[PDB]
Amino acid sequence: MREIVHLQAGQCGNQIGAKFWEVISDEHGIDPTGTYHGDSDLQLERINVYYNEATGGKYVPRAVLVDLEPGTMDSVRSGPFGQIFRPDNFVFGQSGAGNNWAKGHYTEGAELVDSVLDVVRKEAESCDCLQGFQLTHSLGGGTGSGMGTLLISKIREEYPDRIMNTFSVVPSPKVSDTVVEPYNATLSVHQLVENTDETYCIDNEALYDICFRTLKLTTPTYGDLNHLVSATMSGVTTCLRFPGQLNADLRKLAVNMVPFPRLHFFMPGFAPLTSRGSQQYRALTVPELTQQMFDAKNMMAACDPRHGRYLTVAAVFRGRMSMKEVDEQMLNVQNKNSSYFVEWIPNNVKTAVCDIPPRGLKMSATFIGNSTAIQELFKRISEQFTAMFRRKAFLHWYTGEGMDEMEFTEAESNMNDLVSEYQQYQD
């Protein structure tokens, strides 16, 4: 059969996944000890896509934890589900990070890439035939970008025939905390654009705005943000693990979103977001879900695509629906804003229907978007580099490691090509 193996990288991806596996486990109903409580036949059915079998009915998560710093993993192993997580999968370095990209990409990685490669192939040999791999990390993450860029390069030649799913969070546009953060962006996204086939784009500021809008709870946890994004990743994965007349394979999807190779960056979209009173104030009806599905406020990924247009739209629906309300609703939105699509392609909707509702709500969905709204994103950073490369701030660290500004010249040149590329296709 066809399975999925995950990699968690960067200290964010440490917090990202840890919420994400607990989302999966509780949905499937396994206790914190690991003894599955048999309640649903279908969740016992397609658990093998992500978990292997240990003795006594314990399903090992087939993911490998990689880091450099103890404390971040110290929390997750001491966390609620660290026991189900594998110390064998806990690979780490005996050094600190410094949030320096070159150190993790040239210095610290060298003595750790060997171990992680030997690890990942061991689970690769353990399982039979993948769809591909997925990664939780950050492009703005110091150790996450540094390690992943190395690993994505090495995994390409090892298995160039599978799916290179990448889940990276974009830092806050207004403030990046890390001051050398844009430098990390160039070094990451430059290599990302070739090796990857799929990329998810996530921003925390929108997650903050989502909290003010629908959460309305003033003071959240970052784990709440982890919970929100895990719901987003879970929805697209419910496609594979659950029945219903929907075609779920990522390549079944990827060919449907990607008209041209350079299109790797995609924006997500989620389904009903509710407030304190709206739960009992809402008639859970197909129109208002789809209306709330296509809300510029329900946007959460990077920014508003109103400034641009839509390349492709793909939303997968979870609940007890029928083939016609999805049919009529697209016509309504198609006629609503017909001009805001591109005249290059008409009818860019790619819908899947999952009949297995979630646990806690019945009628749900998930949306993945590729619009013409990424320009401002790399435009925003573009002024930063043209500024901070004018006199080369913070240069002596990386140059001391063995960095040369020539590497920066092509990295920006590659992106400015993408600047025109995204521009030219739509404009």
Binding site: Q280, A283, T285, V286, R320, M321, S322, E325
Partner: protein
Amino acid sequence: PRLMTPPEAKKYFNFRYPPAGAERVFYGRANDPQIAPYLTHGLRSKISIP
């Protein structure tokens, strides 16, 4: 959570909102409380036997 409907409000909820078991088929207000002895007999008029 609350009850799905008041005991006398189902019919109009089904009529105004077709989601009576998803967006289901509703007839007119007249037939809402009527008895329905229809599903057993036939539809065609007859076959004229010469």
